[PDB]
Amino acid sequence: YPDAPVALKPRFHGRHVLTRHPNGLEKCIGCSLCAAACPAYAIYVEPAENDPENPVSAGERYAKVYEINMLRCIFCGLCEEACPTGAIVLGYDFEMADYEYSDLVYGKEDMLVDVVGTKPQRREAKRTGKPVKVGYVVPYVRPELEGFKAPTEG
Amino acid sequence: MVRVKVNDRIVEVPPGTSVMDAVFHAGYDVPLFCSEKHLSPIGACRMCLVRIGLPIQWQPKLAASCVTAVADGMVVDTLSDVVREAQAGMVEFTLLNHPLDCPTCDKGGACELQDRTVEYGLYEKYELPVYTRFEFTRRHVDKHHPLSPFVILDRERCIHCKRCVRYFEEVPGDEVLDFIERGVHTFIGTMDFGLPSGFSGNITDICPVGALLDLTARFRARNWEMEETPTTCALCPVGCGITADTRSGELLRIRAREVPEVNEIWICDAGRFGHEWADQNRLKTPLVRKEGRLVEATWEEAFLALKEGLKEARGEEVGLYLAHDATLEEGLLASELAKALKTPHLDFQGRTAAPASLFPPASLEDLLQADFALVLGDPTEEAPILHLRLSEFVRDLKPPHRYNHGTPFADLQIKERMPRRTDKMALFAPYRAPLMKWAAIHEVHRPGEEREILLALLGDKEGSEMVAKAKEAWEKAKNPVLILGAGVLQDTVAAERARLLAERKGAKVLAMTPAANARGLEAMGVLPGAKGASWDEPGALYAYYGFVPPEEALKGKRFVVMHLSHLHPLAERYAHVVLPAPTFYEKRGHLVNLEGRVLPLSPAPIENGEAEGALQVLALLAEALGVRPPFRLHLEAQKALKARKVPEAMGRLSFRLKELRPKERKGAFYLRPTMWKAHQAVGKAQEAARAELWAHPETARAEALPEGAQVAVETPFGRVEARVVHREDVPKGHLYLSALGPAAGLRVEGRVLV
Amino acid sequence: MTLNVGGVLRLMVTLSGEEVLEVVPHIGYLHTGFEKTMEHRTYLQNITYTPRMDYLHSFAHDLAYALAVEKLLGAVVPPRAETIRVILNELSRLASHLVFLGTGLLDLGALTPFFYAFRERETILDLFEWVTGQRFHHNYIRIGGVKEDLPEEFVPELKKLLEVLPHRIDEYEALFAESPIFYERARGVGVIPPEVAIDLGLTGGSLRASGVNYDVRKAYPYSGYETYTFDVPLGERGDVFDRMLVRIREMRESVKIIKQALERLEPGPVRDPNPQITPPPRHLLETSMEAVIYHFKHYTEGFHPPKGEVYVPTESARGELGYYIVSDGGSMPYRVKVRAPSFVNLQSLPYACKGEQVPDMVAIIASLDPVMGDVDR
Amino acid sequence: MRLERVLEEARAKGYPIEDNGLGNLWVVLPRERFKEEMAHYKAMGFNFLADIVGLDYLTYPDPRPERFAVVYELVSLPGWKDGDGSRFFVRVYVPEEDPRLPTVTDLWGSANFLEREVYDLFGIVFEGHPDLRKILTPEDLEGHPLRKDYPLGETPTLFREGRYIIPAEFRAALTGKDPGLTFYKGGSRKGYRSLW
Amino acid sequence: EREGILFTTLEKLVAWGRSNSLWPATFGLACCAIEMMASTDARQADVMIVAGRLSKKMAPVMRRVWEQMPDPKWVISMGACASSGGMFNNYAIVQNVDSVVPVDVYVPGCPPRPEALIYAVMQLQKKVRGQAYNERGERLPPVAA
Amino acid sequence: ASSERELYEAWVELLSWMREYAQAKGVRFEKEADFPDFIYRMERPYDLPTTIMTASLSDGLGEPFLLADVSPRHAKLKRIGLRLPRAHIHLHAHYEPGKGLVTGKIPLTKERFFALADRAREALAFA
Ligand code: SF4
């Protein structure tokens, strides 16, 4: 059924997403706590000092580099669990197969809330000029994915 | 010894012992904030409280175990509900006004406050547990504020131990930090803005929380994420144990590794904040000259191009020149390569006219135990940590007893604000040297004049008043020790008289050699032969360089091979075959201490590129010269050293040597020995490792030199710009140049270009 | 004449004629090495490593482990967690069994009955996705109790499936009971002498399929099974016909545990509020310094159980199961020996099918219900 | 009750009896007396042999009699004739230089696969086993993985631009014999237990 | 010839041809094996799909299975353990089945949903049509040989 | 009461004067710290006007001569505070209805604030 979208439960463990507050600040404070709890060593974090004029988060610390190896990742939600800010929350995407090992290491810009599609989806939808079509539908979005607009007609 | 019974365990332990040490000694534990190895203990945090029984007659109030002595037949309870309830309470009083930064705070998983809270706090009274009682406005103050370009201060996190302010007063002796207001309002602050002393990075490893943090390494990774590489610091003769912290090839931060025999738990600032340059700009492939310029070449193309420049060479025209920090193995091969390949000129970057091997090495231990301290040179700058063993020596402190857990946590022997003895030492230096303060017998001479001061001390002339009081002091001295560094060891005259004075009286020496592995390379026979060509004398015709020599020794030679790590401008213009080499941070093998101790070097996971150690490069350039070398790798090299019979790690290797090759002194300029080395002027160490020019305010302004102007200066060792300083202690009509290399304690020509 | 027949198991069946002389099995092909790699992880982190061995009835590994630890540092599993843990455990039992049953419905040609077994299982798995967000390897069990509370939709949906199963299980018993071909297929074959199964340790709930009344939830009661209405099925002579049936009976007694536990479900906590053992409530991380210190410390370097060795035995869809944990007072376990029901279960396979036919020797293994993940691990 | 007759017997015969407050108890037999004494155990009514767990104690903070030791789990099935349900563990320390320890193959048939795993993963040899052959570890693998001084064999995980991670240099979690990231460890992180 | 409209327009026809005559030959290992038998149940062979932790003992076997196959052929890797070593980083597991066999497509998941493995082959599908590029912009070779 | 909201309203404005005086007399204004009840507020709601809990007016060296703070949303006895670091002088501004921001009985106007900041600047600032 690649014709009819698969309904997954609102709790499902999909492609990680980083969230923002309303203010627009990123929730992440590059504490690297999520990476520290990961049983599979699949998160790499390089911190950075906020710019008072042009802020990224709220504290004095934001995430310069944020990288997850989607091949290493087991999808526990241990990271979402260890987070103090509600930053890294597993989302719904699953259509994320690909060809070259190192292409599957997602970056911060692959995961921000605003992003719609997995790496391969958006890339193809790049060289094609055709919008991204996700293959899922959910009854509603978790409260924890506040913002993450997705197919929720139910 | 005295009998103590901790909880259910009884232990032997010397009289003076802190109950805290006796407690830990039985293998127990207790919260412990304000006390620190090697500092005066005071009960200030009130964490280490125990219950004490002493006849069983429980004392009515709880004791600070860290400042309580132990009595014969004493009981110590550290588990009672009375104890534990009190602890959990004291943990609560601490966390009361604290900020809530743990995720953002760089003090991560290495924070004593965090560990002690999860250990002894939140007490189990016998459903829903209460985490925080205090529900008011926490203390809000000044945050993320740098004290120096190396140290950043969070005052909100400070827990008012005294670890830092105590230390400044006690160990280096530079009271540049103290508390301010009082009550709940007090805080750490400074008025000596720079953070003056050259031992200010140590407060970084002590501060029990993240108030005082290493700015050189702010926001890089969380403490557990760092891979830690224990090694030795080769920036000078002392060879302090260190830890090199690295994540993904780049060098993050330097810290101190305890090694009580030598440095205890202290590092010097150059030792700890000058790492900026070893991970920043570097030569990653072997270079070779093509069309008046150098270009990229494989190790293959470069082994041939090296066979070329040397095919036309007789084995006696060969030079073997190593750097000052070459390994004990790199110096042995070079000795053998140059032995089989009969050559007279093989030398090392820092070699001193008078060999440090002349004198019998003295252990830092001996220094504390000595009676009188005769010093010519500035320990602060030559062998910085000696500053700190003399701070202990001056206070009369002596080697502590060793418990099960090693160095004591609470040495009752160290009192806070101890008196300092000015009758115990004598300093002689070309300027108002730092430790000249803690010395009654002190006199400011001019460069290369020690030769005469030393003659006087023997008893064959007449020195100034100080030099007479000093002779008489070493006279009545029961077991004194001699310390000497630049001019003494660089000037055959003095150095010969030096070794004599200390021969007559059976006393050992501390040679603050300008070469780091000095005592060891000499031990390997890496000393020039009859011929003469030294590391600064342009002599041979085809030679290997482990560094960047004086422009005067390159210019001329037929073939040059520089085995650098970075690319100097003097190499990209006079060099034929340049080869990437590893720093001492990423090397492996052994060194030998200014006290004769053999220390190990371990290799940090830094970005080496296509680099190979001089042990390899040497073996490769021995082929292109005929004889196949006897050394390939470290495992096998180890057998050759063990053959000559050099003791294992930590052991001392005795090796004397009588012979000295003098050289004359063109006294116009003086290469003032400094702590900071010249290749550390990167990033933050940028301003602190700049060069300096010192002259007396008359002669200063006589040669057109304002008090704060950026002057260019030329020496046999190169053209360096330099800040110019007026100093009433600089001898008239001389100029002191910051000898930021291993060419310190030298007299040379040169002038100020305009 | 030695033939080399080799799920992801390999067999050196020595055989001249058509009988079977001796089967010499060879395993090690899914040897992931959990027991070593687990000496190198947090206690919390190992909760992701348990489900991956018996990936079919996976929750039993989760529970078996959580049990030995909770004992070890002394944690109190909240009533609501204890309850959710048995519903969840047995809901996983049916998943494993449904599979064993399903693989049987094909050797037997029954096809619409199978296409249903698959649909049941899929409906069990969606329930898992409902509360745990995964089909399997749910990181849901915790040392305190459970990761979080269960969603609103879970009860109503468990009711649907708990409603159509009752007679559903009976229908399966029926097709195999009124065994058209099955009789002539399984009745004689695969002899398990009661007193030899007790020598080779074939604990496999296909032990009671040969007349032994040993189910650990009864003999050594644990998670409050101690207090459930509980029928332990038995089989007459230990053939494969009975083994297949025993497991179908076990399905009802599961379904009854479920209904029973589902009643005593009142609102409350779901894990032990002890700060030393359980990370602080999520909301006060913005207020208590202690919380932050505790939270930070908890998720980096775990907590430290006392020096000691422990073992609690549990019952899976494959027999005795239980972790032997040696603690050294650290953030991670010093040794973790897992009692694989499926590993000992296989020593009773050479005897199982000796002298028998050959094409029968498929069903003669399928009846031992082995999962390689368990045997090899 | 078949268990009390074991305990009443080991008490008189100088066998140490190990007990944790959680529900398990041991009895540590010497090297010699192990062989026969265990045979006596089956005759006593001990039906089923649950597991056999190999233990390497090299990196254990407190000292033990010898480096290696094996533990057995003897039971009397409650589902048979006169089964009590008396279960217990019996331990045998085994010298580092002499990995020799007799088989229980004569007595229990479970000890077949179970003893070969304890031989494959720990280097421990069993006198008289039908065939002591590797079980789980590949044929050419040299050594014995499950013992402390044999490398877990990890690989750095990889990310985008020379950014790697070495697990052995990354683990925040302490390991019994490890003093930790501060100067020392004491208190609840030296081992902690609630009081029900 | 090889680079001529004619030739090329054949090999684009041939590719689109066996872009639909793909005959998956699953190679189940652990947990992943069963989650694929839910996509096989919903609808000489090329295209082996490796589904589960590949043991080091098991490796030389999957080696021969792969060699003794037809030639226009592709490998799909199913979930963490096949793709990387998974959470299982140690002496007993191969750390990327590409150590032993050319992986054409990689599919994240542990295990991956059934419906994601459908997407996985639509990828290798559109790849043997030669209509697929990596994140750098490069066109990718239909078969990894 | 609802005062809490009007007190926070007044926290914004005091901050407003800080930024003004700062640019005006050309002296560093430094955001010293954010509310942890924002940083660590997760899915939880947040209606406060700013995210800055500790502000300061520092000199050239960065050592502050004026420090300002208000208490978080979850702490008791909410006050806004002014401290001259190093000179031992602390202030405690509450909020009265109709009256406005008071240090007890004396209204804390822009003017009066500017007076204090000046006194402080001239006296305290090291460089
Ligand atoms: S879901 Fe688990 S395996 Fe994946 S990044 Fe998060 S902690 Fe790591």
Ligand code: SF4
């Ligand atoms: S996602 Fe969360 S845990 Fe990870 S670095 Fe960001 S704030 Fe910290």
Ligand code: SF4
């Ligand atoms: S100093 Fe320690 S307790 Fe305070 S924020 Fe930093 S890690 Fe946390």
Ligand code: SF4
């Ligand atoms: S800054 Fe650190 S070392 Fe100094 S008193 Fe404060 S807590 Fe102690």
Ligand code: SF4
């Ligand atoms: S005194 Fe010398 S060896 Fe010690 S840290 Fe400083 S430079 Fe390094």
Ligand code: SF4
């Ligand atoms: S990737 Fe996950 S689901 Fe697949 S074999 Fe590995 S552990 Fe099992």
Ligand code: FES
């Ligand atoms: S009072 Fe601070 S440790 Fe003794």
